[PDB]
Design a protein around this nucleic acid. Structure first.
Ligand SMILES: [Zn+2]
Length: 37
RNA sequence: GGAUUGACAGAUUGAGAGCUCUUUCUUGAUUUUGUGGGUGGUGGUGCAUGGCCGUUCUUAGUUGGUGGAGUGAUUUGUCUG
């Protein structure tokens, strides 16, 4: 499967990642969990 | 394969205000917009009004009960010192 899973410690590695310019944004939370890669 | 709804990177504003936008994940089923239909307004209405306050006012005023006077208003009591 494409559309990357995340390393979310509040989830079971299933939340998708909003790919931006230098951002896989976790939308599960409001603002936090902005792991930059 | 999207009601409400949140944001970082940045023009953004006064903001380290995601509010709008490049954004794209999900926090999400709870009426998100019109009609019904509240609630608020420190909005006009104390000239529509509750209480309360002030003034008429430290000058003392007020009145039923039987009786008199008139016919009825009204008086007499409540007035000459
Ligand atoms: Zn994350």
């Amino acid at each position: 499967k494409l559309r990357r899973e995340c390393s979310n410690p509040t989830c079971g590695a299933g939340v998708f990642l909003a790919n931006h310019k230098d951002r896989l944004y976790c939308g599960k939370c409001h603002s936090v969990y902005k792991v930059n890669a």
